[PDB]
Every structure is written in structure tokens, then in C-alpha cells.
Tab-separated table of N, CA and C and ligand atoms in Angstrom:
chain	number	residue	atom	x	y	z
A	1	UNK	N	-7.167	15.743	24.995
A	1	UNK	CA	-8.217	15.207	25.854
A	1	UNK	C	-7.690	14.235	26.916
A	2	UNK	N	-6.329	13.978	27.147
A	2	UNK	CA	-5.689	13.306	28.382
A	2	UNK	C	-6.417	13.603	29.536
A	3	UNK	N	-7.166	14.759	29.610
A	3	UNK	CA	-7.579	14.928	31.183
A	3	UNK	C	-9.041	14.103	31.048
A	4	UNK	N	-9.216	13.543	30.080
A	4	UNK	CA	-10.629	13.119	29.744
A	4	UNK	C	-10.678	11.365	29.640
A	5	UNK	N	-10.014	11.299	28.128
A	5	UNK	CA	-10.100	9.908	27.665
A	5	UNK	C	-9.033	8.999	28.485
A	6	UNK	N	-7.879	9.398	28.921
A	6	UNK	CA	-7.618	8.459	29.582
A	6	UNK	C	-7.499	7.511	30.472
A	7	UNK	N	-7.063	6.652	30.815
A	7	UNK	CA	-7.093	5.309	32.017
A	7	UNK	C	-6.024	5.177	32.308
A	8	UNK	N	-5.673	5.059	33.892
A	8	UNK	CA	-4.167	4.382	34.499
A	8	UNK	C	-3.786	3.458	33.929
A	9	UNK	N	-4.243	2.617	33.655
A	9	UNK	CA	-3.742	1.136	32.918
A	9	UNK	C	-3.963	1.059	31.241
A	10	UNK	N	-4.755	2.288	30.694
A	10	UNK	CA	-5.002	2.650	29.296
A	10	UNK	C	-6.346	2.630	29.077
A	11	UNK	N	-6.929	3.351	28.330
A	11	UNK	CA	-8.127	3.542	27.304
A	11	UNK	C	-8.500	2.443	26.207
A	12	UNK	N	-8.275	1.250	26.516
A	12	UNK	CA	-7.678	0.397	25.856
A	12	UNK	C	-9.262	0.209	24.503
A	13	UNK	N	-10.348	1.223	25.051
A	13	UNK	CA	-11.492	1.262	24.163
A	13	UNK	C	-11.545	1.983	22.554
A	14	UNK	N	-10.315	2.650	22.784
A	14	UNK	CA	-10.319	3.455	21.769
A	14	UNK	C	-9.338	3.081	20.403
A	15	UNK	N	-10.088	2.592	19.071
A	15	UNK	CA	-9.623	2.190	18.317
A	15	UNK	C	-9.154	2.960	16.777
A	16	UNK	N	-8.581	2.013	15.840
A	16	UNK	CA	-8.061	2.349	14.964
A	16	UNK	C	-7.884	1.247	14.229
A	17	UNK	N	-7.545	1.492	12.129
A	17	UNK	CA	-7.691	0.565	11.802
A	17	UNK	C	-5.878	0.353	11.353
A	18	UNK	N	-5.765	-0.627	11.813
A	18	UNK	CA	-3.922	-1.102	11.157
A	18	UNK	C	-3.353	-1.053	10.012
A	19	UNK	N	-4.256	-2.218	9.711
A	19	UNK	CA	-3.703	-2.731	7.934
A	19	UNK	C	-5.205	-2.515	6.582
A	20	UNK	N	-4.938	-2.293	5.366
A	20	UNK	CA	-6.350	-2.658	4.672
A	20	UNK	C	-5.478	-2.707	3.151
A	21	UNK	N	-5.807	-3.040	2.464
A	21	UNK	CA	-5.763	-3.624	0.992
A	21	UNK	C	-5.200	-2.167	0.063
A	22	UNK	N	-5.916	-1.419	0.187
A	22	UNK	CA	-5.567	0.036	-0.803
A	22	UNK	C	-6.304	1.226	0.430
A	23	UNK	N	-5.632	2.235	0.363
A	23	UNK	CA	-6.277	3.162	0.636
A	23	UNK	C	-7.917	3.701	0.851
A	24	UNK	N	-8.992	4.143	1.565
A	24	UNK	CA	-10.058	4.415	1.427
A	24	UNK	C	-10.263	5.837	1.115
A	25	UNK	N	-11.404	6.226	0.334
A	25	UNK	CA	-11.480	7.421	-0.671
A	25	UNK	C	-11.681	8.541	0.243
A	26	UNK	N	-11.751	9.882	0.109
A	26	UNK	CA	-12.261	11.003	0.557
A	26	UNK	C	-13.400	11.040	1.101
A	27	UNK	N	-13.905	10.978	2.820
A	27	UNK	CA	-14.893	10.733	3.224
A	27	UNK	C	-15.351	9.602	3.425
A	28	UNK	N	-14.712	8.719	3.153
A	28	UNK	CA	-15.316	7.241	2.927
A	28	UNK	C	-15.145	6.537	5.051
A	29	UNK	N	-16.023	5.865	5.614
A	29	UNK	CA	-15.744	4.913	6.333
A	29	UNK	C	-16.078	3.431	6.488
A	30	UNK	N	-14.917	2.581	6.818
A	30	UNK	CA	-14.979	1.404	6.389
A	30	UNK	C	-14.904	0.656	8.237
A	31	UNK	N	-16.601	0.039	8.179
A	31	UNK	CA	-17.044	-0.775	9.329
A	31	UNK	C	-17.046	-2.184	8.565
A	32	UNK	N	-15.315	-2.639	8.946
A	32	UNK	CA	-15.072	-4.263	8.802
A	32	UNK	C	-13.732	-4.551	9.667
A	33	UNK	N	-13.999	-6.011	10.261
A	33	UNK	CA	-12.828	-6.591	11.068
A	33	UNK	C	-12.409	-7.624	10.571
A	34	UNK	N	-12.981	-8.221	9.208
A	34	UNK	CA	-12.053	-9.818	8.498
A	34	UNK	C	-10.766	-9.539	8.613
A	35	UNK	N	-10.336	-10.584	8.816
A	35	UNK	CA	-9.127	-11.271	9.014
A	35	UNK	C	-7.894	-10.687	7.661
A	36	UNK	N	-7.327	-9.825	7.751
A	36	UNK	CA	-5.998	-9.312	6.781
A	36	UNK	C	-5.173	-10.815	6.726
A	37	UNK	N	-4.943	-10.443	5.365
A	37	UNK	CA	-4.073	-11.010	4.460
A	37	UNK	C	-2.743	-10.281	4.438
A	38	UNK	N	-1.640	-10.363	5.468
A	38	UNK	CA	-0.173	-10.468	5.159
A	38	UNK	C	0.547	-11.381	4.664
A	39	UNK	N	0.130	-12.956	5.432
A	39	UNK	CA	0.333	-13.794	4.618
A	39	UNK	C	-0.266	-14.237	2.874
A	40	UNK	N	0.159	-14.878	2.383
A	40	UNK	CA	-0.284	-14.952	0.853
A	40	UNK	C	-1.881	-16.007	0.939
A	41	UNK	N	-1.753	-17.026	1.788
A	41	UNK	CA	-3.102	-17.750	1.888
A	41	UNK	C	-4.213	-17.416	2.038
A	42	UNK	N	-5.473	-17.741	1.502
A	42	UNK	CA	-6.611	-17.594	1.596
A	42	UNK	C	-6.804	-17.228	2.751
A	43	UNK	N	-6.641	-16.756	3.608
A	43	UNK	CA	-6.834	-16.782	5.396
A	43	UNK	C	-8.098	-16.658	5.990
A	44	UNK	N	-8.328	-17.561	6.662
A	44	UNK	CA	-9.591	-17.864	7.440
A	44	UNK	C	-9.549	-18.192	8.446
A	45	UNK	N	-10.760	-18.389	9.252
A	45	UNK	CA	-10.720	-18.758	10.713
A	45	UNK	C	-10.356	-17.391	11.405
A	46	UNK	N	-10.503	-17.454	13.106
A	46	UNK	CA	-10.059	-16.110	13.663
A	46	UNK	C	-8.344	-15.614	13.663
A	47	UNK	N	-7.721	-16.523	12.831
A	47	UNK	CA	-6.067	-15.572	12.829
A	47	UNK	C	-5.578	-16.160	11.172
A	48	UNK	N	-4.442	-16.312	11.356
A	48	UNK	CA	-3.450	-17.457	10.032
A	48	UNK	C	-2.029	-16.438	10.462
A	49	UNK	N	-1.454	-17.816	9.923
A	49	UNK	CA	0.514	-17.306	10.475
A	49	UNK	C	0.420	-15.951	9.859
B	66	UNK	N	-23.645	9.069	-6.363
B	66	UNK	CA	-22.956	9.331	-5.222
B	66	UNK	C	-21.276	9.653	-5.636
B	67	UNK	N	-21.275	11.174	-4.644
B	67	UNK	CA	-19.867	11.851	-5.003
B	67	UNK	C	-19.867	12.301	-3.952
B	68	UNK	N	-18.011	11.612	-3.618
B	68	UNK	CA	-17.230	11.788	-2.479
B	68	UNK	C	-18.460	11.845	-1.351
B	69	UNK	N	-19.003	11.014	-0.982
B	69	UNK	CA	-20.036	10.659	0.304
B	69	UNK	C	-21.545	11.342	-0.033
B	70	UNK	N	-21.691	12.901	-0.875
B	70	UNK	CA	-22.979	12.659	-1.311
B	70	UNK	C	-23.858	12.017	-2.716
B	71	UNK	N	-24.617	11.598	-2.035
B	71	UNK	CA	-25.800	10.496	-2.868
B	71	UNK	C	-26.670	12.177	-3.768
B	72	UNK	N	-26.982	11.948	-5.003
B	72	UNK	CA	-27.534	12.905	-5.665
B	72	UNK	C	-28.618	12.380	-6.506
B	73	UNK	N	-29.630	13.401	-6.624
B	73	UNK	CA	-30.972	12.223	-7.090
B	73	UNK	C	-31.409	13.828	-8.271
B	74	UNK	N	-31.784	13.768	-9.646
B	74	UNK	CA	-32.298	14.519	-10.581
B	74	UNK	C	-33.892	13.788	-10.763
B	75	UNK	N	-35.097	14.030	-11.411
B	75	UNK	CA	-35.493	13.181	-11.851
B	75	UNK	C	-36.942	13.968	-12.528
B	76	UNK	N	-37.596	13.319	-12.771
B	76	UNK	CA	-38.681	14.048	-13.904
B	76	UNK	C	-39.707	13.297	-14.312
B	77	UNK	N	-41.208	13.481	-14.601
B	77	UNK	CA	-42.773	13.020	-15.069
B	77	UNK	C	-43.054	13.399	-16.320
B	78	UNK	N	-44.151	12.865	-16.574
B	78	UNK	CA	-44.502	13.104	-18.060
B	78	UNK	C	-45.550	13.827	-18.737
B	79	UNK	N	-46.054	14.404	-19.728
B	79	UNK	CA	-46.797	14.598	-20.429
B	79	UNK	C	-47.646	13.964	-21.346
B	80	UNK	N	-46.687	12.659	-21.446
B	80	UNK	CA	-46.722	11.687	-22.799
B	80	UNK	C	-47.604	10.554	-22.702
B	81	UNK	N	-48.509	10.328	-23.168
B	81	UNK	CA	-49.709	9.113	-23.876
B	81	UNK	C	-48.958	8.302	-24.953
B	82	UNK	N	-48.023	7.546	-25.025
B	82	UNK	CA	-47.522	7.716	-27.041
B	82	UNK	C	-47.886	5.477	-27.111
B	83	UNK	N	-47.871	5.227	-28.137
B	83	UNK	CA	-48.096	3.734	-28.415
B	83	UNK	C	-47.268	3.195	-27.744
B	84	UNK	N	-45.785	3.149	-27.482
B	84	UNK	CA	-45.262	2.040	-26.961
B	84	UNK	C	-43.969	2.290	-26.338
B	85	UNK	N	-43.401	2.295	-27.292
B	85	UNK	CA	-41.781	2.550	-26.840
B	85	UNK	C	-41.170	4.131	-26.422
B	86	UNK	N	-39.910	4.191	-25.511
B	86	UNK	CA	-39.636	5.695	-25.593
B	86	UNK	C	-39.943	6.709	-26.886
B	87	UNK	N	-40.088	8.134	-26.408
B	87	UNK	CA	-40.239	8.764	-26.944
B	87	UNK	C	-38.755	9.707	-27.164
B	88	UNK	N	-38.324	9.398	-28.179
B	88	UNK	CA	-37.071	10.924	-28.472
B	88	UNK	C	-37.898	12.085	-28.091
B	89	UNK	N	-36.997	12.825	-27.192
B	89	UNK	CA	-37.646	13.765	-26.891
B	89	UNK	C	-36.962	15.083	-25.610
B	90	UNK	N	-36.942	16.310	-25.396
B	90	UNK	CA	-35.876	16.934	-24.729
B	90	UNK	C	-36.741	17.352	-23.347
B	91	UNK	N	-36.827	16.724	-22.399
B	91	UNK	CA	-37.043	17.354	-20.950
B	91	UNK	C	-35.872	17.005	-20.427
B	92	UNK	N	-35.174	17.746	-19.405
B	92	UNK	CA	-34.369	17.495	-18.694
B	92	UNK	C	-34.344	17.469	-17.063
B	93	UNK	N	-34.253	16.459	-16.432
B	93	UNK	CA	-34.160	15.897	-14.969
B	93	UNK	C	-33.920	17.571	-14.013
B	94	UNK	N	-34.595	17.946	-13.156
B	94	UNK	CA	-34.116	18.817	-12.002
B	94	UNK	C	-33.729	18.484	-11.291
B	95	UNK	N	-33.159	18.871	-10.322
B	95	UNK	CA	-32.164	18.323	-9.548
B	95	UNK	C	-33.415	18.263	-8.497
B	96	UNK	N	-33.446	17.100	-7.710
B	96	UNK	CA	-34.706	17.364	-6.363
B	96	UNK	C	-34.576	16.818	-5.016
B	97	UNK	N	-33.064	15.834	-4.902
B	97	UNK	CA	-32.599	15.585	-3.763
B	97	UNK	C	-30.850	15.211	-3.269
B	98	UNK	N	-30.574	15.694	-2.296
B	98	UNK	CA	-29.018	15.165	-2.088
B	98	UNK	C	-28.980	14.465	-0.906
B	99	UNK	N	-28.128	13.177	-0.185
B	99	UNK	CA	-28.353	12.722	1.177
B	99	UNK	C	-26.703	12.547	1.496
B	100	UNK	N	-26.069	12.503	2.556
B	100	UNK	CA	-25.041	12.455	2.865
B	100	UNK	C	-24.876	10.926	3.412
B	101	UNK	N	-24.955	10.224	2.412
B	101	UNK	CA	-25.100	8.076	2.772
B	101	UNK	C	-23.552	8.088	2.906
B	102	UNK	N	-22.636	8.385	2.186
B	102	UNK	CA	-21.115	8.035	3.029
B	102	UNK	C	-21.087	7.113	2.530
B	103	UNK	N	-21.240	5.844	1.622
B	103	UNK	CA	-21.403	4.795	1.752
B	103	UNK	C	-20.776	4.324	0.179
B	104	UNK	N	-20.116	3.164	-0.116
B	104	UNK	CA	-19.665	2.702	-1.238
B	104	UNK	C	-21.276	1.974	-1.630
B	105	UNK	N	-22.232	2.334	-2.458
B	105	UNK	CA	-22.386	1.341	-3.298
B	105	UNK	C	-21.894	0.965	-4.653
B	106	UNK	N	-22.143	-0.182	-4.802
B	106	UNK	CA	-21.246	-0.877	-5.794
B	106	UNK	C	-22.577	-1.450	-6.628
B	107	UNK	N	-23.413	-1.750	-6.354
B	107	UNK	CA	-24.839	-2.163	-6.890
B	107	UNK	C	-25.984	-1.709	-6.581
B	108	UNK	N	-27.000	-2.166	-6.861
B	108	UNK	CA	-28.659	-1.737	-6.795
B	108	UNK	C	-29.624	-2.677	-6.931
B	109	UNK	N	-31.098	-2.979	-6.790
B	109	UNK	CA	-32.093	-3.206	-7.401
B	109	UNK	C	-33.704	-2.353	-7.156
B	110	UNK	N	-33.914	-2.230	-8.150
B	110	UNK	CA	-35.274	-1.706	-8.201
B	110	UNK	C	-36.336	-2.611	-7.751
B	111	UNK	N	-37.616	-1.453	-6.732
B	111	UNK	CA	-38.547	-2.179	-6.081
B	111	UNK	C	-40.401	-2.367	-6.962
B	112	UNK	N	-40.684	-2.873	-6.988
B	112	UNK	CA	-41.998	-3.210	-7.714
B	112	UNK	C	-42.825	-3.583	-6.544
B	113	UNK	N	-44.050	-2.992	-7.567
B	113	UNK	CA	-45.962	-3.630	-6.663
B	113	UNK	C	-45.789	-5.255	-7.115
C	408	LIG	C1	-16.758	-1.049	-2.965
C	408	LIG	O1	-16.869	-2.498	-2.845
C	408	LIG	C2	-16.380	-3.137	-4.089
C	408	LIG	C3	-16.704	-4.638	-4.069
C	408	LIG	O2	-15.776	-5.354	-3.231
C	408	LIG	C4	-14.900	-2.782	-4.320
C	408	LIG	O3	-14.529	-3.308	-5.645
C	408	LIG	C5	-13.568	-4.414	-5.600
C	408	LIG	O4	-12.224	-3.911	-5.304
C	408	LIG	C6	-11.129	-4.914	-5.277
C	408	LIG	C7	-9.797	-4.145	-5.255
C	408	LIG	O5	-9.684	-3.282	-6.410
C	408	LIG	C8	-11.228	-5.894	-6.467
C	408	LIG	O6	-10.444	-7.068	-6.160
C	408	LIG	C9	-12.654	-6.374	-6.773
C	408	LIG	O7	-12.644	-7.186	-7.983
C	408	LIG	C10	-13.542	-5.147	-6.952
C	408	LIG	N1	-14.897	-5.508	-7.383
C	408	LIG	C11	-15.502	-4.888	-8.399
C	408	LIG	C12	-17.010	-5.154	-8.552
C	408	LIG	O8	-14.903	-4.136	-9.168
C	408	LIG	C13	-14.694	-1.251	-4.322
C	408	LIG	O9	-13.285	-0.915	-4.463
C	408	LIG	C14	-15.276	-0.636	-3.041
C	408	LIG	N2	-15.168	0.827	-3.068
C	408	LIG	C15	-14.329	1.495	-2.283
C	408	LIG	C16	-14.447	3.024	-2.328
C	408	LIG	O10	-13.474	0.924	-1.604
């Protein structure tokens, strides 16, 4: 779909999810943006080291 | 709910009896499926 979705400077609308805790099941979709835990701390607020 | 569909059996009565369940063999038909997608993990039931 390059002749479609894209932008000179990027599509920068079109997302994906990075990181999550375990795997999600067969069919399953997961609508959440909290804050991942790479670091070991409770992490809160909008980032943590 | 399996792998995204929600499945519903369920069944009415015949029975007048004093109080408590009745032992007894009817079995649930199957009467609805919905495609919810959705993890629940809990419930509560609604009352008048
Ligand atoms: C549905 O949501 C529940 C509640 O968060 C998830 O169960 C939790 O999963 C994590 C990781 O195993 C545990 O730390 C929690 O203790 C679990 N809670 C319970 C009540 O067991 C569940 O995994 C989610 N379902 C899916 C398909 O991801």
C-alpha cells in the first residue's frame, strides 16, 4: 500500500505495540498505553529511566 | 468465552417445588454466540 499509506516525511500515524509483559492470546486485542516496566521500579508518571 | 467468542446455553422451568434446587436432568441449549474479543476476568449480575 506505499502508493497509498505513505508520506514524504512518513506516515508517522500508523502504529504498533513495542514491548508488553507476556504474549497476547489468539484473537485477543489489547487497547492500553501505561507506561512499561524495563526498568525494575514501580514506574509512574509519563516515562522512568 | 473461547478464543474471542462469548457463548451463552441456557434454560426455564417447569418446576413449583418448596424451596431449594431441585436434582433434576434438563439440559441448557445452546441459544447465543457474540464475537466480544475481549478478556473478561470478572462479572456481576443485574437485579430489579
Ligand atoms: C485479563 O486481565 C487479568 C487481570 O489483570 C490478567 O490476569 C493477571 O495476569 C498477570 C500476569 O500473569 C498477573 O500478575 C495477575 O495476578 C493476574 N490476575 C489474575 C486475576 O489472575 C489476565 O492475564 C488477562 N488475560 C489476558 C488474555 O491477557
Amino acid at each position: 500500500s506505499n502508493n497509498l499509506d505513505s508520506k514524504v516525511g512518513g506516515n508517522y500515524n500508523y502504529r504498533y505495540r513495542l514491548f508488553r509483559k507476556s504474549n497476547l492470546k489468539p484473537f485477543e486485542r489489547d487497547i492500553s498505553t501505561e507506561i512499561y516496566q524495563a526498568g525494575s521500579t514501580p514506574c509512574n508518571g509519563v516515562q522512568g529511566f | 468465552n473461547i478464543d474471542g467468542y462469548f457463548k451463552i446455553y441456557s434454560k426455564h422451568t417447569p418446576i413449583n417445588l418448596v424451596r431449594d434446587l431441585p436434582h433434576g436432568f434438563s439440559a441448557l441449549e445452546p441459544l447465543v454466540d457474540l464475537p466480544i474479543g475481549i478478556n473478561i476476568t470478572r462479572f456481576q449480575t443485574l437485579l430489579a
